[PDB]
Amino acid sequence: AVPPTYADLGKSARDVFTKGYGFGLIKLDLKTKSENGLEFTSSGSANTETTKVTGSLETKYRWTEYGLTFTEKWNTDNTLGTEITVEDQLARGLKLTFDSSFSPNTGKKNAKIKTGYKREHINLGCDMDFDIAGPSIRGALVLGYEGWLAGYQMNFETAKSRVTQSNFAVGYKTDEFQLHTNVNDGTEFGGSIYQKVNKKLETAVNLAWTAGNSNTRFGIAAKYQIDPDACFSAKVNNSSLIGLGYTQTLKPGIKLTLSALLDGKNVNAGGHKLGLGLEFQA
Amino acid sequence: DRFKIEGRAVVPGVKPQDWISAARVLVDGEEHVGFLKTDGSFVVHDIPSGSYVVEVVSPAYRFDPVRVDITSKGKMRARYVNYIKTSEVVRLPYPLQMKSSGPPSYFIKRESWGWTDFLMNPMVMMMVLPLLIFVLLPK
């Protein structure tokens, strides 16, 4: 039941590739849960290469009285964003999302409507983007029976012409084996496999192929937790890229993560990309 | 020593006699002034040596000024109007043939807000959810 959506389809492998290391960036997040319903998150990203300071304050209002969720975010470039989520209002698996962005300093507005239908094995989703440049409509439908799953994504724009962007993603998802192949307009061909040998060993393999210039690139990643608080991550790319990350829980909420990407050669040309991450949860 | 400059201006459409009304041409701006013929042509006499900019002045369809170089010997060389640069850009034949692009924009444009476009407001979208919820009740 509840088949995976298009964005979530394969998100395990990308998340393994994404989460774990943030070299070149400084991670600083604080999450706070209140007693009744209040959620507060303050995250701060610091860059040493570009010397940039980025951050967002995110306030979450979980209302189970009617299924309403109120989210308000604030960035550093004077951008204001509000979001309303309604789930299980009158239908079975209907979800309505309203996202709005407005700037007080200058004047700029953007709108986004998300709609989601979830059923026994049928997943429907429609995103309508309202902007001055041009409205766009994007629909993703996922169908599967037991383990065989296939999803279709389409993107259409009324501003220019009959532009249509096709996406066909076919995969096999089960308890410990997860394989997924994504096809973009018969041009992009991606294949991700992810498996778990034990409760401590995780392996992932990614392949990318194209029909235009016949470019092929593959990469493998391993994740292993020595202890419930100590974890290690390694990733190797096709050409020479190697990345190592190590995470350890220091205080019962405080965790420290270290990331290092090495690009070195033997012709006197080498480079290090380091990154520190630290978060607090309350 | 005095010379004469003649030229022909062709409108893309309308009527030549329609556009001749209230139409004059300037060589310096208040020094030498030329008048147009019945269909169209500016013929100016009583001119000395030097460089001058020929421009046809009209509240209607406008024209691009053209620089003209007059020599004492009797050579006539026409070029594009250049102020920042003072060299030869492009050389074209002498029989001035100006082609008016059209009516210059004298008034500015103000646009209203579209019905499909005003739905992007932070406030208008926060009312559409109550509107839909209240619509789904009687149905």
* Method used to solve the structure: cryo-EM
Cβ(A211)–Cβ(A186) below 8 Å: yes
- Give, rounded to a whole angstrom, the gap between the first and last alpha carbons of chain A: 33
* DSSP per residue, chain A: --PPPTTTTTHHHHHHHHTT--TTEEEEEEEEE-SSSEEEEEEEEEESSS--EEEEEEEEEEETTTTEEEEEEE-SSS-EEEEEEEESSSSSSEEEEEEEEE-SSS--EEEEEEEEEE-SSEEEEEEEEE-SS--EEEEEEEEESSSEEEEEEEEEESSSSS-EEEEEEEEEE-SSEEEEEEEETTTEEEEEEEEESSSSEEEEEEEEEESSS--EEEEEEEEEESSSSEEEEEEE-SSS-EEEEEEEE-SSS-EEEEEEEEEE-SSS-EEEEEEEEEEEE-
Among A86, A109, A131, beta carbon nearest to B122: A109
CA distance B101 to chain A (A): 28
* Residue from B88, B16, B77 nearest B49 by CA: B77
Rounded Cα gap, residues B77 and B68, in angstroms: 6
In which region does residue B46 sit, left (phi positive, over 0), alpha (psi from -120 to 50) or beta (all else)?
left
CA distance B104 to chain A (A): 28
Handedness of CA A18, A19, A21, A23 (dihedral sign): positive
For tokens 């100016």, name the residue. B44
Please give the single-letter amino acid code of residue A163.
V
Tokens of B9: 């201006």
CA distance B138 to chain A (A): 13
**Record: contact B119-A130, CB cut-off 8 A:** yes
Cβ(A234)–Cβ(A16) below 8 Å: no
**Record: contact B120-A96, CB cut-off 8 A:** no
**Record: contact A84-B122, CB cut-off 8 A:** no
For residue B129, list chain A residues with Cβ-Cβ distance below 8 A: 84, 86, 96, 98
Residue B21 sits at the vertex; the CA angle it makes with B18 and B25, to the nearest 5 degrees, is 120
The angstrom resolution of this structure is 3.3
Rounded Cα gap, residues A86 and A171, in angstroms: 30
Rounded Cα gap, residues A99 and A133, in angstroms: 17
Among B116, B125, B133, beta carbon nearest to A100: B125
Give the other-Cβ count within 10 Å of B139's Cβ.
Answer: 5
Cβ(A124)–Cβ(A5) below 8 Å: no
Among B117, B122, B136, beta carbon nearest to A100: B122
Chain B interface residues facing chain A, Cβ-Cβ under 8 Å? 116-117, 119-122, 125-126, 128-129, 133, 136
For residue A132, list chain B residues with Cβ-Cβ distance below 8 A: 117, 120
Handedness of CA A122, B125, A34, A64 (dihedral sign): negative
* Residue from A30, A14, A19 nearest A275 by CA: A19
Chain A with chain B: Cβ pairs closer than 8 A: 36
CA distance A87 to chain B (A): 12
For residue B117, list chain A residues with Cβ-Cβ distance below 8 A: 130, 132
